[PDB]
Ligand SMILES: CN(C)c1cccc(Oc2cnc(Nc3cccc(O)c3)nc2)c1
């Protein structure tokens with residue numbers, strides 16, 4: 001038993017991390033097969049940060065201007081190109097540590113592990129959720145750009161995030177591995193509106209199920225509700241609307257606990273309308289929304305999904 | 307910026323994880339050089355866990371009773387012996403991925419990363435604190451026994467914990483890698499009292515410094531406190547007493563922020579007495595105590611490992 005924010009083991013990703021330097025600036029790159037991926041603002045200086053012309057800056061560069069180091073071994077760069085906001089440096093050697101992998105663009109509300117890195121060397125690993133407003137709340141210092149987010153299914157690493165910037169609000173923004181930013185953000189040193197955020201309803205319900213499985217049951221009540229009534233409450237409390245697809249995804253947790261999904265929705269409704277009265281759920285004094293139903297099952301391997 | 311509960315990169319430890327099966331009992335082992343370390347209760351049957359005579363059970367065991375799988379390959383047990391509560395299986399093949407390592411017995415209040423494993427395969431990684439009462443509040447399901455906890459310093463993995471059991475209360479107990487249990491616990495299926503626990507006061511103060519570094523400052527006040535007077539309030543709220551040694555350890559964080567240690571104590575004194583009034587610190591609605599002063603500096607400094 002127990003329930004803890006749990007990241008994926010990072011070994012497979014560690015072996016892909018390298019250090020990329022262009023003139024002054026160093027950040028991290030991801031070496032897969034014979035291509036290194038890194039944020040394109042590596043080719044930038046503070047003179048250029050408010051409105052970089054990335055096409056012109058890249059024209060001034062040549063293969064040998066990109067210093068790429070995998071641990072202690074220097075890599076030979078044989079080509080470069082820009083795809084959206086990432087650079088792809090072709091190297092003469094395929095990474096012998098390349099895992100089985102895919103590139104994926106995740107949906108808001110999905111979770112992933114981040115391997116925070118500096119100078120191509122790993123520093124730590126933690127779980128993030130892609131907020132509804134397409135930011136993440138991580139731990140990213142100077143030089144952490146190019147650190148990636150990922151999920152592991154058996155033996156395939158699905159890379160879904162590369163870190164590019166911290167907004168003036170202190171939250172974080174980045175791209176998929178094709179270089180496309182999550183959300184409306186751009187790679188320039190400017191104040192940028194992140195949309196209104198909201199709480200990931202389906203994740204709160206999954207975490208309430210995890211709590212019941214772990215023996216925390218005080219919030220269970222004698223009430224039920226409708227999807228429509230619940231969604232009225234959710235909208236009032238800045239929660240994401242709950243769809244039948246969400247109900248469907250919560251099915252296996254409903255089955256293990258025997259608590260109908262709409263009964264749990266009535267429990268959540270009461271928590272939102274009355275607060276938690278100073279009590280806790282799974283060690284937390286607020287309602288947690290960064291565990292997916294998948295995340296919960298992984299840590300409660302008693303429920304039946306297949 | 308940003309402060310997150312962060313585990314060490316787990317790659318070096320993943321390469322040492324194997325599966326140990328004895329009869330119908332499978333758990334995890336740690337393969338360093340030509341020895342596989344695992345909990346000795348792997349040799350117990352269901353009906354033997356009330357009061358096993360491990361000496362007699364081990365005598366009855368033969369090398370071929372221990373099936374050890376390392377990925378696709380099964381190792382060949384050529385030796386079996388017992389060191390306190392850990393079983394040591396000599397194998398005819400040394401681990402080529404053995405990292406630089408030490409065995410270390412940690413102190414209550416210190417933190418370490420746990421690599422949760424099942425059937426010899428790493429499942430996830432998270433950060434824990436050894437509680438003052440020598441338990442840990444982890445996330446462990448059946449078969450997780452043998453999962454290890456560790457720290458990394460530079461390039462050396464310091465193994466400090468091996469998981470052995472879940473207490474009937476749902477917290478967790480284990481040994482150092484010499485097989486000595488942390489706390490008053492023994493490896494028999496008995497109800498065992500874990501001592502009264504306390505909050506790690508030095509860690510809470512370290513975490514408050516982390517919040518100030520990340521822009522959370524509302525808790526700060528212009529109140530003064532003596533160490534002795536703060537300890538009167540701490541004892542009322544089941545906080546462990548703060549010593550000069552603790553004050554000294556927080557020095558670097560006091561220097562970085564310009565907030566004297568005892569002034570931070572005055573801040574914590576108010577938070578314990580009046581609570582948080584619904585406000586949060588670093589996203590949390592309660593006081594966090596699983597970050598050491600080192601953890602805070604390490605994170606806010608970007609320290610890496612290679
Ligand atoms: C997207 N992103 C992170 C980005 C984009 C383009 C250039 C780029 O490179 C920089 C930006 N800023 C600075 N220094 C700096 C110091 C104090 C205040 C200040 O606003 C800026 N140094 C390099 C980063």
Ligand SMILES: [Cl-]
Pocket residue numbers: 111112113151295
């Ligand atoms: Cl995830």
Ligand SMILES: [Cl-]
Pocket residue numbers: 417418419457601
């Ligand atoms: Cl630690």
